[PDB]
């Protein structure tokens, strides 16, 4: 009963919702039509829907991660081996319940995460993730000595947007180009990066440039930070230094031109290794080193 | 060795602080955003106290209220507070007489004049006092002394010149001078009553006042006997030296570590500064003594309590402490 349309429906919304959360909700809604009782009629349909979504996907792995998590949850659900109605009801409940959860997670974050701020520490923020922004705003709320540094990101002018968002807060800020980020090593005390997908080992999928930043941090011995909630978990491991399922160009040397038509071709999404990250920020208590892998193991058991 | 009572000489040095001490009591005033009595109490506890006695006269009701509000009022305390209420304005002799009249004095009682906060362990001192007492029958009281900052220059009110022995640690002469403040008496006096008995004469000036006394049961009786001694340092010690009662010994304990009593304003400031730094070994605000306190430690000797708000872009120097519930703006040095 459609899912692509639902996905499309969320573009100018957000800020209050959460794309992957929305997707999950949509999935749940789809599920509560074709009966969760008959497993043959339902699971296959769900799979088909997921395939369709993948086909319609441009540059996103997080939705897939969400859907597989949902599937896993569903599978777990039927372990009670009792009546087939209560379980169904629970499943039905668990969609808006997921939406509700996000708020609670945020709340949890905003009380433990505020302990990290030290006296006169300058913070650089990279990537458009809602969680990081929330953390920042709720740190301002707490009233702690802090500074904000903006990086000039170029997918569809994201850095500028981030800067603008920061402005409507009242915090003094300065914009730095992604090429010029290397020179800033002593002034910025902590390097903060948001994530779009957390892998097996603890590797991060995000945006236009993260790996380089990580490398720089390693070189300067400055702490590297990953800020996320709890829905972006993929059972994946990259083969090379940077490899992802992409709809865009993986390094394309364009043919001989004069009038300029196609030139903007290359890497858009980047992967960073486990060694670079020193601290991980999540709502599930406090966990850092290799907890994601453990979580995955718990989930899949395979 | 165990079971020792404490008597604290409070509300004694009023009008010495010339602007203040008129509406509220002297000791109730905060040292570092927290009352001065508390530190003294802590020190007493560290030493070994089983009962607390305070001398109040000037604004006693407020003191009583404070006591009622304080932590030691509740039954968990090893020492209970019972205040001595006396008629207005009297010297330390009169107070002693009053105490004697009441009669709680047993064994080795602790008498502390003013408010003192120091880092040195007291058990060892107590042991020393006991051992020395065990030597001869006619031993009186203990005095506390610490090594000064090489040369004396900021000391004008009480620059006492202590002529001391190394073998027995006993005072020979006590004298006060206005020498650095006013050039009228740059002077030294030595008496010949104890020259041909001590032999080892060491003349010193660089020693700071503490005014913490461990006293035997003889002292109040002595005070009762000789009513001419109104003070305890200037007339009393000298009298003891010049053989008022023949064949008697007094103590002067020497310690390399920091020990200074509260006396004036500049001195108070210096004490506060010392407290802020790491001069006193265990005495830090971040440990939280009053239980309502929520102090925490930060880099470069900076103290910050909980609910402290400070705005962005303010360059700070060295050694700063901020109390709870503060709102500070921008562009401050």
Multiple choice CATH, A103-299, 1.20.58.2030, 3.30.420.40, 3.60.21.10, 3.40.50.10470: 3.40.50.10470
Q: Looking at the partner chain, which of A145, A171, A172 has a beta carbon nearest the beta carbon of B310?
A: A145
Is A143 in contact with B309 (Cβ distance < 8 A)? yes
Distance CA A14, CA A21 (A): 10
Residue B195: C-alpha distances to residues B66, B162, B170, B176, B281 (Å): 51, 15, 13, 21, 39
Element (H, E) at B310: strand B309-310
Distance CA A94, CA A28 (A): 8
A172 touches chain B (CB under 8 A): yes
Distance CA A95, CA A84 (A): 19
Distance CA A255, CA B232 (A): 103
Chain A residue with the nearest C-alpha to that of B308? A143
Q: B204 - beta bridge partners?
A: B162
Q: Are B77 and B71 in contact (CB under 8 A)?
A: yes
Residue A235: C-alpha distances to residues A58, A202, A293, B73 (Å): 20, 11, 9, 63
Distance CA B253, CA A196 (A): 70
- How do strand A188-194 and strand A224-227 relate by DSSP bridges? parallel
Tokens found for residue B109? 């009682």
Question: Would you list the DSSP string of B195-254?
Answer: HHHH---EEE--EEE--EEEE-THHHHHHHH-TT---SSSSHHHHHHTTSSSS-EEEEEE
User: Helix, strand, or coil here: B47?
Assistant: helix
Distance CA A32, CA A1 (A): 11
Q: Looking at the partner chain, which of A119, A143, A147 has a beta carbon nearest the beta carbon of B299?
A: A119
Q: Are B148 and B208 in contact (CB under 8 A)?
A: yes
Superfamily the domain B5-276 falls into:
Spore Coat Polysaccharide Biosynthesis Protein SpsA; Chain A (3.90.550.10)
Nearest 5°: the CA angle A22, A23, A29 is 90
B312 touches chain A (CB under 8 A): yes
Q: Which residues contact B148 (CB under 8 A, 6 or more apart)?
A: B155, B206, B207, B208
Nearest 5°: the CA angle B185, B191, B195 is 140
Is A146 in contact with B313 (Cβ distance < 8 A)? no
Half-sphere exposure of A276 (CA within 13 A, CB side): 22
Distance CA B287, CA B275 (A): 13
Residue B270: C-alpha distances to residues A229, B249, B265 (Å): 51, 34, 9
Distance CA B67, CA A52 (A): 77
Residue keyed to tokens 């009169």: B94
A53-88 as b/e: b if 16+ CB within 10 A: beeebeebbbbbbbbbbbebebeeeeeeeeeeeebb
**Backbone torsions φ then ψ of A242, nearest 5 degrees:** -145, 110
A265 touches chain B (CB under 8 A): no
User: Helix, strand, or coil here: B118?
Assistant: coil
List the one residue out of A224, A269, A279, A219 whose CA is nearest residue A247.
A269
Q: Which residues contact A241 (CB under 8 A, 6 or more apart)?
A: A211, A271
Distance CA B125, CA B1 (A): 12
Residue A165: C-alpha distances to residues A125, A161, A162, A175, B313 (Å): 12, 6, 5, 13, 21
Q: Are A247 and A256 in contact (CB under 8 A)?
A: no
Tokens found for residue A214? 């990580």
Chain B residue with the nearest C-alpha to that of A171? B312
Length of chain B: 333
A82 touches chain B (CB under 8 A): no
* Cα pseudo-dihedral B215, B221, B227, B229, rounded to 10: -20
Distance CA B198, CA A67 (A): 95
List the one residue out of B50, B62, B49, B55 whose CA is nearest residue B22.
B62
Shortest Cα distance, chain A CAs vs residue B305, angstroms: 13
Q: B304 - beta bridge partners?
A: B296, B322
B299 touches chain A (CB under 8 A): yes
Method used to solve the structure: cryo-EM
3-state SS, one letter per residue, for chain A: CCCHHHHHHCCCCCCCCCHHHHHHHHHHHHHCCCCCCCHHHHHHHHHHHHHHHHHHCCCCCHHHHHHHHHHHHHHHHHHHCCCCCHHHHHHHHCCHHHHHHHHHHHHHHHHHHHHCCCCCEEEEEECCCHHHHHHHHHHHHHCCCEEEEEEECCCCCCHHHHHHHHHCCCCCEEEEECCHHHCCCCCEEEEEEECCEECCCCCEECCCCCHHHHHHHHHHCCCEEEECCCCCECCCCCCCCCCCCCCCCCCCCCCCCCCCCCCCCCCCCCEECCCCCCEEECCCCCCCCCHHHHHHHHHHCC
Tokens found for residue B306? 């909980």
Region of A256 please: left (phi>0), alpha (psi -120 to 50) or beta. Answer: beta
* Cα pseudo-dihedral B99, B103, B104, B107, rounded to 10: 100
Is B302 in contact with A147 (Cβ distance < 8 A)? no
- How do strand B207-209 and strand B139-147 relate by DSSP bridges? antiparallel
**Backbone torsions φ then ψ of B9, nearest 5 degrees:** -80, 90
Distance CA B330, CA B322 (A): 16
Q: Which DSSP letter does residue B4 get?
A: -
B298 touches chain A (CB under 8 A): yes
A146 touches chain B (CB under 8 A): yes
Rg (CA), chain B: 21
Chain A residue with the nearest C-alpha to that of B327? A143
Most distant pair of Cα atoms in chain B: their distance: 70
Residue A146: count of CB within 10 angstroms of its CB: 20
B138 touches chain A (CB under 8 A): no
Is B302 in contact with A119 (Cβ distance < 8 A)? yes
Distance CA B298, CA B312 (A): 17
Shortest Cα distance, chain A CAs vs residue B33, angstroms: 22
CA dihedral over B230, B233, B235, B238, signed as positive or negative: positive
Distance CA A247, CA B126 (A): 84
Is B312 in contact with A145 (Cβ distance < 8 A)? yes
**Backbone torsions φ then ψ of A120, nearest 5 degrees:** 55, 65
Element (H, E) at B16: none
Distance CA A102, CA A99 (A): 6
List the one residue out of B280, B273, B281 whose CA is nearest residue B320.
B273
Length of chain A: 302
Q: Which DSSP letter does residue B300 get?
A: T
Q: Are B108 and B3 in contact (CB under 8 A)?
A: no
List the one residue out of B220, B10, B256 whose CA is nearest residue B147.
B256
A118, A121, A143, A173: which to substitute to probe chain B, counting the most B Cβ within 10 Å? A143
B309 touches chain A (CB under 8 A): yes
Distance CA B30, CA B205 (A): 31
Query: What's CA B126's distance to the chain center, in Å?
Result: 16
A195-226 as b/e: b if 16+ CB within 10 A: bbbbbbebbbbbbbbbbebbebbeeeebebbb
| Preceding-residue numbers of gaps in chain A (C–N over 2.5 Å) | none
CA dihedral over B121, B122, B123, B127, signed as positive or negative: positive
Q: Are A77 and A90 in contact (CB under 8 A)?
A: yes
Distance CA A100, CA B207 (A): 70
Shortest Cα distance, chain A CAs vs residue B311, angstroms: 7
User: Helix, strand, or coil here: B285?
Assistant: helix
Is A172 in contact with B309 (Cβ distance < 8 A)? no
Q: Are A117 and A139 in contact (CB under 8 A)?
A: yes
Inter-chain contacts counted by CB atoms under 8 A, chains A and B = 13
Shortest Cα distance, chain B CAs vs residue A145, angstroms: 6
B302, B304, B310, B316: which to substitute to probe chain A, counting the most A Cβ within 10 Å? B310
Tokens found for residue B37? 């009595």
Chain B residues in contact with A145 (beta carbon < 8 A): 310, 312
First-to-final CA distance of chain B = 53
Element (H, E) at B164: strand B162-164
Tokens found for residue A58? 């441009």
- How do strand A271-272 and strand A204-205 relate by DSSP bridges? antiparallel
Question: Would you list the DSSP string of B91-109?
Answer: -HHHHHHHHHHH----SSE
Query: What's CA B139's distance to the chain center, in Å?
Result: 22
Is A172 in contact with B298 (Cβ distance < 8 A)? no
Deposited resolution, Å: 9.4
Distance CA A26, CA A10 (A): 11
Tokens found for residue A84? 């087939």
B177-199 as b/e: b if 16+ CB within 10 A: bebeeeeeeeeeeeeeebeeebe
């Amino acid at each position: 009963f459609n899912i692509t349309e639902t996905y499309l429906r969320f573009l100018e919304e957000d800020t209050e919702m959460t794309m992957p959360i929305a997707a999950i909700e949509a999935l749940v809604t789809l599920l509560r039509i074709k009966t969760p009782e008959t497993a043959a009629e339902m699971i296959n349909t769900i799979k088909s829907s997921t395939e369709e979504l993948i086909k319609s996907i441009p540059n996103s792995v997080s939705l897939r991660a969400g859907c597989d998590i949902f599937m896993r949850f569903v599978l777990r659900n039927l372990h009670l081996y009792g009546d087939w109605e209560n379980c169904k009801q629970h499943l039905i409940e668990n969609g808006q319940l997921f939406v509700s959860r996000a708020k609670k997670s945020r709340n949890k974050i905003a009380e433990i995460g505020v302990d990290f701020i030290a006296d006169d520490d300058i913070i650089l923020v990279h990537g458009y993730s809602r969680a990081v922004f929330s953390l920042l705003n709720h740190a301002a709320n707490k009233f702690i000595r802090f500074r904000c540094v903006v990086t000039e990101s170029r997918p569809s002018k994201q850095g500028n947007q981030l800067y603008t968002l920061l402005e409507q807060k009242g915090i003094p800020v300065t914009l730095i180009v992604d090429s010029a980020v290397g020179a800033v090593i002593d002034k910025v005390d902590k390097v903060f990066v948001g994530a779009e997908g957390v892998a097996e080992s603890g590797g991060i999928i995000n945006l236009v440039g993260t790996y380089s930043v990580g490398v720089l941090a390693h070189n300067a011995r400055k702490p590297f930070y990953v800020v996320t909630e709890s829905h972006k978990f993929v059972r994946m491991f990259p083969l090379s230094s940077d490899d992802l399922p992409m709809a865009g160009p993986p390094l394309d040397f364009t043919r001989r031109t004069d009038d300029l038509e196609d030139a903007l071709r290359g890497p858009t999404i980047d992967y960073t290794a486990q060694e670079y990250i020193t601290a991980l920020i999540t709502d599930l208590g406090v966990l850092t080193p290799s907890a994601v892998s453990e979580e995955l193991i718990k989930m899949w058991y395979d | 060795e165990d079971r020792l009572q404490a008597v604290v000489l409070t509300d004694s040095y009023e009008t010495r602080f010339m602007p203040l001490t008129a509406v509220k009591p002297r000791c109730l005033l905060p040292l570092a955003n927290v009352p001065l009595i508390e530190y003294t109490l802590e020190f007493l506890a560290k030493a070994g106290v089983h009962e607390v006695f305070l001398i109040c006269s000037s604004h006693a009701n407020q003191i009583n209220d404070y006591i009622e509000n304080s932590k030691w009022n509740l039954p968990w305390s090893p020492f209970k507070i019972t205040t001595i209420m006396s008629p207005e304005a009297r010297c330390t002799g009169d107070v002693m007489r009053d105490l004697d009249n009441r009669g709680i004095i047993t064994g080795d009682f602790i008498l502390v004049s003013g408010d003192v906060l120091t880092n040195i362990d007291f058990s060892k001192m107590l042991e020393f006092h006991k051992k020395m007492h065990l030597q001869d029958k006619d031993h009186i009281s203990t005095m506390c002394l610490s090594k000064a900052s090489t040369y004396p220059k900021t000391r004008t009110i009480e620059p006492a010149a202590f002529v001391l022995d190394k073998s027995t640690s006993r005072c020979i002469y006590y004298q006060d001078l206005p020498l650095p403040s006013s050039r009228e008496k740059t002077s030294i006096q030595i008496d010949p009553e104890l020259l041909d008995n001590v032999d080892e004469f060491v003349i010193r000036n660089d020693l700071i006042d503490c005014r913490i006394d461990i006293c035997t049961s003889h002292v109040p009786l002595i005070f009762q006997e000789n009513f001419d001694y109104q003070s305890l340092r200037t007339d009393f010690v000298k009298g003891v030296i010049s053989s008022d009662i023949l064949g008697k010994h007094i103590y002067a304990y020497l310690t390399d570590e920091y020990a200074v009593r509260v006396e004036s304003w500049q001195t108070y400031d210096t004490i506060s500064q010392d407290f802020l730094g790491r001069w006193c070994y265990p005495l830090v605000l971040d440990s939280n003594i009053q239980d309502d306190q929520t102090y925490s430690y930060e880099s470069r000797h900076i103290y910050k309590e909980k609910d402290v708000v400070l705005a962005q872009s303010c360059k700070i120097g060295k050694c700063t402490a901020i109390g709870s519930g503060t709102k500070i703006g921008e562009g401050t040095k």
